[PDB]
Amino acid sequence: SPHVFISYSWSSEDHKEWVLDLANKLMKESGVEVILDRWHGVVGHDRFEFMENSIKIADKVLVICDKDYCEKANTRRGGVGTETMIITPNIYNNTKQEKFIPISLGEENGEYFLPDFFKSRFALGWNYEDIDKSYKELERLIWEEPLLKPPVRG
């Protein structure tokens, strides 16, 4: 089954719970395996290593783009360290684009919360007023295999 890593920031307790609820839902309803830091008991200073490794082994990587994740992804106040849990330009660049499914939680200035360095400007814009529709589309994107195109009819 698809193995799905969830990259997110611990912005607040409510946000952690939303991500946890999503992880559970995906495994319960969508038949995928989810790689989640809390289920692995990841130590703070192993977060970068967990992130790097999990992206490598995942089929799909959900990037939970709330304002916090985006602003930290854009700024990098520390200069990237062992505790870093937010995707970096270097990690993004070295990963096939097709792995990432950015989910924008809200928007600003008429645009999705997406880190500056994400090359495609696409994201699943989460619709809090139609969760079923948003979740259905997330599920579709997870099971899609864009690396695979049917060949030419001869």
First to last CA, the chain: 32
For the record, the structure tokens of 45 come out as 């200073």
CA 96 to chain centre: 14
Q: How was this structure determined?
A: X-ray
Q: Resolution reached, in Å? A: 1.8
Distances from the Cα of 67 to the Cα of 1, 10, 45, 71, 74, angstroms: 31, 12, 23, 6, 11
- Distance between CA atoms of 71 and 87, rounded to whole angstroms? 12
- Distance between CA atoms of 114 and 116, rounded to whole angstroms? 6
For the record, the structure tokens of 11 come out as 């912005």
3-state secondary structure of 54: helix
The residues with which 100 forms a beta bridge, in sequence order, are 61
Nearest to 63, CA basis, from 4, 132, 8, 129: 8
3-state secondary structure of 38: helix
3-state secondary structure of 134: helix
